[model samples]
Target: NPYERGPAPTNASIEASRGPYATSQTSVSSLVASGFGGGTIYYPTSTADGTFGAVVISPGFTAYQSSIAWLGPRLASQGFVVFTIDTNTTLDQPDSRGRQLLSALDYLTQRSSVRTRVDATRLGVMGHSMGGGGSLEAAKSRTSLKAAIPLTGWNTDKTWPELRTPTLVVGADGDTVAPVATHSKPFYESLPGSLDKAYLELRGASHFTPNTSDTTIAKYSISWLKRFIDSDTRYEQFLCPIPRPSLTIAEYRGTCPHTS
Candidate 1:
């Protein structure tokens, strides 16, 4: 609980526009960026709570950092160092985006002005579509990562049994692009059966669902990152029992007790 930040979480808090901590952001100029196209970094403005776990989110193909920008302040205010990155180009493939995400993380932890605000040991990755697939790739390469979230992710190389990072695979039941059946489901199931992981299928959602700030995505992502990255089991309640199908969810799958 020492790494814990903010007050105990609540349905209201997780679904709110922001969390307890105030946030501030700065741009990472692409000119000076190494190995990636720098986008932006959002972090809790106060250093009183000490360093926080960090996550780098890559945008899908043919997308800019704006596609994943909403996640920055949303996750940061909840106690995290969030980097929403741009790939070397809008058309970069997942493999390329994956390395950019890792490179962005290194830049955030090692050279960013706010490096002191991040706990380099506890880091994670996320993205949408190809970027989501890149998230899986990033986690696979860096097994030390604390968590991963692939939002309606797409990857030609689907089997991910080798990923050691705890992952939450979010898929849209109605997505024609990278549908759950082929992309997200296989990505989730292929994760080592014993790995801390889950699949959340959003009802009436499309591949673009993650591009906006949806409450369902925000709430669960907040819980997943807090549970795995900060090791804050206090947020586990929202995830256990696998979150029964509801208005926004087509289905949910996970093991109970979380092996926490």
Candidate 2:
């Protein structure tokens, strides 16, 4: 049971200090209950109709709901409504937290302003570490979800066998946390969607660096999110030629795989 710490001071201050690149915090919801003990939600601003769709984030291990503040504003400033939840640090019971995503969706969709504003039909889920493991589990449950992106996601199971959902998995080439060889490769391979599923191993990357404040790193992330969330085919230019020569990153594409 984690108590509310309100707005994360460091992230809030950075957003305020950054000015133009920053998105103003509009509202924060605490202890939203629909089962799963409820979770925290953060919204950027009050738009008549949300233009950038909505995102539900399940943060990494030992991190609170507000841990993704930097990312929340970045997405919100671009017109996406970002919502993150506190699962009370229970990674073992991922289903509990994963199921609560539905509650968040229900809560947001019911809001008069957001009802017509957000395209609930185009929602996405993002997770890291243990939360990443949970993302895969949750994706297995929800088929209607538009997209799912796992950043350095963890994997304990063998595979989904017949994953039909569109999924994007980003991993670090030199990551020590979630190894590309084990977690990412298999997770990407298990999914059933050929064209709809992808895996990218960032070069010279680290576990946490990909999700940082730097311009290039964040751009890659935003690009991945925007492509799937908006159904933009243009994102192909950047991530094409994925899966090394061994055809491990992608096997069904049939295109000549990249040779390491």
Candidate 3:
């Protein structure tokens, strides 16, 4: 396992804005090396001395980076340096999208402005639809990633039987484009039990919910990223605690061995 069971970190909460640092946004091209193409980068205005964990995010197939734009500020505010990216082509395949995701991380890790700002050792990935599946592929391609959360993710060629990265697969019960039976649930089930993972299904939600900053999705995304990527024990509380009604969550399950 990547983590040890432990008490919550001294600083942990699931509130919308739970970090001590403010956040800032800038075009990816302006801050990083040009080879990575276009995207947006969100970073904490100030960090607590150490380098901050980072995440590279991608939008669904044929969808622009702006489709999942809300994640940039939401995650960055909570201490993760988030990159919302645009693939070279709108029709890029999941594997291609996965390549772009890792390429962006490479740029961030080496570029002078962001190199020191983020901890290359503590990185993660996330996405919407095809972008979500691509996030998993990226994690498989780059096992060094600390965590991954694919929202309404879709991809047929990929499987998680050997996936090692801690992951959280978010699904929408009302989605027809990528039905829970074929896409999300199978992906969740295939993830190795030895790894830290979770599956959350949103009731009456559609595949598009992840594109926006829906409160519940935002809460779980932040909590998962914080718990796994940042290794903040405090966020583990949000992961367990059983079926949540306030969020209208239809179902939630996973092996969060660290939670009480």
Candidate 4:
């Protein structure tokens, strides 16, 4: 429980728009963004709780940081320091986005204004579309990463047997872009069976489903990040048992008693 933060969670809590911690934010201008295009950093507005695990999120192809801006406060208010970034260029491919993710993490933990508030060792990566594919790339290049979540990811290279980071592959049932059949599903299945992984297919959702404020995405994402990055067991209850096809969940897949 040492790694756990916030109060005991409830169905209502995870599904709410925000969490227990009040939040604050600041900008990282692209002019000095080092390896990645600069973006915003959202964090809890407190120092008493000690260092929090952090993550860097990248938007999909042809999108800017504003496209995924909604996630900053949604996730930061819940606990972690969430940095949603832009790639070096809007047209950068997934692999490049991967490097950008790690670069941003370095900036976030090593020299950002909020550096003192972050746990350098506990970190994660996330992205949308090609950026989602980049999330996998970051995990591959940095095995130390605790978690990697790809939202309706798109990539030409599909198999991922080499990753050690616990992963959650989210897809949309109706996605015409980066369809699950070829992208998310293959990515989820290719991971080492011994690794902790899960697949969540949003019911009737489109590829852009993750681009907005959606309860299901935030709920499971926070749970995944908490369970892995913080190694917080309290969050396991929401993911284990495996959610079934519901009004919002088209399908769910994962091993019981997550290996991590």
Candidate 5:
């Protein structure tokens, strides 16, 4: 139920007579401190100049990297380079999802294609549920990431003092799996400066509603990418999340301590 077509052959198709699609996915070595061995990537439709600012997405607990394939191209279409990795840390220790996320970063940074296309310096991280928690942990571990978006996930708030980057946390009032008080609170408190921070709570949205497969939720996600990835500030308006029907939301922004 985490969407992304639930592992079926992606309904995605490369559009013909429209600038040639060059999308592909593969597993590679982990390059981060997490010591993960492999990761995956999705390159956008090819162009004479194919390099892009890559965004590495880490899926939630018990989820696989392929689940985010639906979003990878969507972000790439907006001029961002998107990638996802299996952060569940293999089949043995399911709780070690955080470590694999770091390895994904490590893998991405060292890639010839990734390094060429991705502005590694301008890279961003994202995740859902447990994956969202992994994103926060990964961001804290790697300073190279420019931004982060956690979807209904945040667990290590007790260690927020270590986080010092621009981030976005999204959730809904009705999300029983991971409440806003526990996931987003400490994450906000941990932010070191007045940097660009956002919290969105979609009134009707549930924990599983914001993934890439759903067209509606997909649209909202695109707007966020436009703001953060495409440098469009309008996306900022949706930052400070607030309580609403079920999925009501908000957004917030400012100078971040790690704006580099």
Candidate 6:
């Protein structure tokens, strides 16, 4: 039943508002984590006696772990282990950011405190802006990723034709930093249609939208992770029949069939 698609098994919360699990954080070794600038590991206080999927997040250029910190606890509250990483430098490139992401993954798999809790096979990656671009690179280099979400992403060099990772590319129409046409749109369009992917454009969104607690983004992020990363079908209900116009979803395209 690897491709089982139906309602979610439990009533556990996956909304970004918060979930049943309490959260905690710990430090990662800086020595073996060079290009990683530094790292913070966040996990649920209760293990639920089952290994959990994990996520690695990279902050945008000149940004620290705090830039994307909100996602850690948000995802952790929903039952996944999350790692928020700082890059080796303030202006690290997407390729370097991608490498750093993997390095952090290695550390997580080896680290004693959180190692046993991670279901290494079920993993995901996310980021904002350049970090988002790095997320694509990371997924490209490691095709095994279950899911990839890039928020207001920016990358122009690669076409990503071979990208098989199930991706949800979030874009903002008002973004001046990484305009939707050049960055997010092209990136999403370049992705092979055979893979499960989606492009969501927020009509009034700005580049900074991903840094804050956006319920629209949060709702989809949690559901996408649940559906693709955690393989929970219960979330499928939320995945389709797109929300109402007032919900702020400007445009969407993907494998999802639209509902009238």
TM-scores of the models, in the order given = 0.99, 0.72, 0.89, 0.99, 0.70, 0.90
lDDT of 2 by residue, 112-227 (tens): 24455566776777777666766777777887776677777776774875555567777767779888788878888777644366666666667775455544334444545555
Q: Write the per-residue lDDT of candidate 1 for residues 140-246, one digit (tens) a residue.
A: 89999999999999999989878889899999988999988889999888888888899999999998989998999999999999999999988999998778898
Collision count of model 6: 4
| Off by more than 4 A, model 4 | none
Worst 10 residues of 5 by lDDT: 2-11
lDDT tens digits, residue span 109-223, model 5: 6744555655555567787777778778777777656677777784754445566556766675577777777766566666765556655665565666655465533444544
Model 2 misplacement above 4 A: 1-23, 26-28, 36-51, 90-92, 111-116, 214-217, 234-236, 240-260
> What is the lDDT of every predicted structure here?
0.92, 0.57, 0.79, 0.94, 0.57, 0.80
lDDT of 3 by residue, 1-260 (tens): 23322224432344454455588877766334453457888888764555788899888878997798888887787777888888877888778888888988888788636677887888899988998888889988988888989999999864688678889899998999988899999898888778888889998899888876677787788778877887777677677654454456888987856532
Please rank every candidate by TM-score, starting with the best: 4, 1, 6, 3, 2, 5
Residue 208, model 6: lDDT of: 93
Q: Which regions of candidate 1 are displaced past 4 Å?
A: none
| Model 2: worst 10 consecutive residues (lDDT sum) | 251-260
Least accurate 10 contiguous residues by lDDT in model 3: 2-11
lDDT value, residue 211 of candidate 5: 57
- Pairs that collide in candidate 6 are 7-234, 8-234, 37-87, 37-88
The better-scoring model by lDDT among 1 and 4 is 4
Better of 1 and 6 by TM-score: 1
Best-fitting candidate, scored by lDDT = 4
